[PDB]
Design an enzyme around this catalytic site. Structure first.
Site, PDB file in Angstrom:
ATOM      1  N   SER A 114      41.466 -37.624  -5.338  1.00 29.19           N
ATOM      2  CA  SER A 114      42.164 -36.435  -5.818  1.00 29.19           C
ATOM      3  C   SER A 114      41.364 -35.758  -6.923  1.00 29.19           C
ATOM      4  O   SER A 114      41.482 -34.554  -7.144  1.00 29.19           O
ATOM      5  CB  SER A 114      43.561 -36.804  -6.341  1.00 29.19           C
ATOM      6  N   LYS A 132      31.306 -40.480 -11.364  1.00 28.82           N
ATOM      7  CA  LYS A 132      32.602 -39.991 -10.940  1.00 28.82           C
ATOM      8  C   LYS A 132      32.613 -38.497 -11.222  1.00 28.82           C
ATOM      9  O   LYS A 132      32.869 -38.074 -12.346  1.00 28.82           O
ATOM     10  CB  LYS A 132      33.705 -40.712 -11.708  1.00 28.82           C
ATOM     11  N   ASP A 141      47.026 -51.586 -12.319  1.00 32.12           N
ATOM     12  CA  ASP A 141      46.611 -51.548 -10.920  1.00 32.12           C
ATOM     13  C   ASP A 141      45.528 -52.580 -10.625  1.00 32.12           C
ATOM     14  O   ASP A 141      44.565 -52.291  -9.924  1.00 32.12           O
ATOM     15  CB  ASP A 141      46.123 -50.143 -10.539  1.00 32.12           C
TER      16      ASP A 141
HETATM   17  C1  LIG Z   1      30.169 -49.618  -5.941  1.00 32.18           C
HETATM   18  N1  LIG Z   1      29.635 -50.029  -7.243  1.00 32.18           N
HETATM   19  C2  LIG Z   1      30.137 -49.393  -8.405  1.00 32.18           C
HETATM   20  C3  LIG Z   1      31.123 -48.391  -8.307  1.00 32.18           C
HETATM   21  C4  LIG Z   1      31.569 -47.805  -9.507  1.00 32.18           C
HETATM   22  O1  LIG Z   1      32.534 -46.825  -9.509  1.00 32.18           O
HETATM   23  C5  LIG Z   1      33.342 -46.657 -10.619  1.00 32.18           C
HETATM   24  C6  LIG Z   1      34.367 -47.573 -10.870  1.00 32.18           C
HETATM   25 CL1  LIG Z   1      34.618 -48.920  -9.808  1.00 32.18          CL
HETATM   26  C7  LIG Z   1      35.211 -47.434 -11.971  1.00 32.18           C
HETATM   27  C8  LIG Z   1      35.053 -46.370 -12.861  1.00 32.18           C
HETATM   28  N2  LIG Z   1      35.882 -46.160 -13.996  1.00 32.18           N
HETATM   29  C9  LIG Z   1      36.839 -46.971 -14.453  1.00 32.18           C
HETATM   30  O2  LIG Z   1      37.105 -48.064 -13.904  1.00 32.18           O
HETATM   31  N3  LIG Z   1      37.504 -46.572 -15.539  1.00 32.18           N
HETATM   32  C10 LIG Z   1      38.549 -47.323 -16.132  1.00 32.18           C
HETATM   33  C11 LIG Z   1      39.678 -46.652 -16.608  1.00 32.18           C
HETATM   34  C12 LIG Z   1      40.726 -47.370 -17.197  1.00 32.18           C
HETATM   35  C13 LIG Z   1      40.653 -48.760 -17.318  1.00 32.18           C
HETATM   36  C14 LIG Z   1      39.521 -49.421 -16.845  1.00 32.18           C
HETATM   37  C15 LIG Z   1      39.439 -50.913 -16.961  1.00 32.18           C
HETATM   38  F1  LIG Z   1      38.169 -51.320 -16.863  1.00 32.18           F
HETATM   39  F2  LIG Z   1      39.949 -51.262 -18.136  1.00 32.18           F
HETATM   40  F3  LIG Z   1      40.163 -51.439 -15.979  1.00 32.18           F
HETATM   41  C16 LIG Z   1      38.473 -48.713 -16.260  1.00 32.18           C
HETATM   42  C17 LIG Z   1      34.039 -45.446 -12.615  1.00 32.18           C
HETATM   43  C18 LIG Z   1      33.189 -45.581 -11.512  1.00 32.18           C
HETATM   44 CL2  LIG Z   1      31.950 -44.378 -11.301  1.00 32.18          CL
HETATM   45  N4  LIG Z   1      31.051 -48.223 -10.677  1.00 32.18           N
HETATM   46  C19 LIG Z   1      30.109 -49.176 -10.734  1.00 32.18           C
HETATM   47  N5  LIG Z   1      29.662 -49.755  -9.611  1.00 32.18           N
END
Ligand SMILES: CNc1cc(Oc2c(Cl)cc(NC(=O)Nc3cccc(C(F)(F)F)c3)cc2Cl)ncn1
Length: 262
Positions: free
Chosen positions: A30, A47, A140
């Site tokens: 979204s 992102k 989540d």
């Molecule tokens: C496929 N390998 C990847 C993919 C990737 O994509 C992401 C992911 Cl998986 C996550 C995020 N951003 C967050 O996770 N933000 C977040 C927000 C609130 C709370 C939390 C946490 F960690 F506390 F749960 C995280 C952004 C992208 Cl680009 N990233 C790395 N490798």
């Protein structure tokens, strides 16, 4: 509003879209698309963003991310904040894929120690989030939001998808703000998912499975095989009563204790 974010965000986190190199698309949503790429000599995930609802989510996410610094939590690289066209969020890319794929798609057979290492790593990350000065409820946590390194270690992320005496339980529960103990429930389900290699209530659809845990108090089956300390964690973890669930500081302890006997 954005200016307030620009100021609170440490300077080194300020990215210019030109600094970021976009290669491929990994996912959609979204918010916009999620690219893989390169930024500051690191392979990264971006992102990229396409209303006041959307921006409120952007500021929220960055405000969360700049605070996070732990080897079991997603790693923030930076954010581009110039103008709403250029909005992007950059994180260090992780190549071992989700825990979901490892268990249900690749269907790889895991040593108990291999299982417990992932479980401990996720417990540490959650412990980290819950122990921030302003604790973060993941809200989540599931095996899709748990990414793995090639050596088998794990990282926690988020892809971003009256009088009470006479009140019906469903009504009472909506008047009761949920806490961090909601993550311990999710975690317990993941823990079962790890050990058994099965998706929780695999024969059911998502909303159907949820209704059996909420209305009919059903949990996944805990076999005799599962070790005493962990089956204990399960029982207490997915307790209907939030107050009955343990803290992740204790979860880590009990699980680390197990890693020594293996
Ligand atoms: C496929 N390998 C990847 C993919 C990737 O994509 C992401 C992911 Cl998986 C996550 C995020 N951003 C967050 O996770 N933000 C977040 C927000 C609130 C709370 C939390 C946490 F960690 F506390 F749960 C995280 C952004 C992208 Cl680009 N990233 C790395 N490798």
């Amino acid at each position: 509003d954005i200016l307030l974010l620009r100021a609170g965000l440490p300077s080194h986190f300020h990215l210019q879209l030109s600094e970021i190199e976009f290669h491929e698309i990994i996912g959609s949503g979204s918010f916009g698309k999620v690219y893989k790429g390169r930024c500051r000599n690191k392979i990264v995930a971006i992102k990229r963003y396409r209303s006041k609802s959307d921006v409120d989510m952007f500021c929220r996410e960055v405000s969360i991310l700049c605070q996070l610094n732990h080897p079991c939590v997603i790693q923030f690289v930076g954010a581009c904040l110039n103008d709403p066209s250029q909005f992007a969020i950059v994180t260090q890319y992780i190549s071992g894929g989700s825990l979901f794929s490892l268990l249900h798609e690749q269907k790889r057979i895991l040593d108990l120690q291999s299982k417990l290492i992932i479980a401990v790593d996720v417990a540490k990350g959650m412990e980290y989030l819950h122990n921030l000065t302003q604790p973060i409820i993941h809200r989540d946590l599931n095996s899709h939001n748990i990414l793995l390194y090639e050596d088998g270690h794990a990282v926690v992320a988020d892809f971003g998808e009256g009088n009470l005496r006479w009140m019906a339980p469903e009504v009472f529960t909506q008047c009761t703000r949920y806490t961090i103990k909601a993550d311990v429930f999710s975690y317990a389900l993941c823990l079962w998912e790890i050990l058994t290699g099965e998706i929780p209530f695999a024969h059911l659809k998502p909303a159907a499975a949820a209704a059996d845990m909420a209305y009919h108090h059903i949990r996944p089956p805990i076999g005799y095989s599962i070790p005493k300390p962990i089956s204990s964690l399960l029982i207490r973890g997915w307790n209907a009563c939030p107050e009955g669930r343990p803290e992740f500081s204790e979860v880590v302890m009990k699980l680390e204790e197990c890693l020594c006997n293996i």
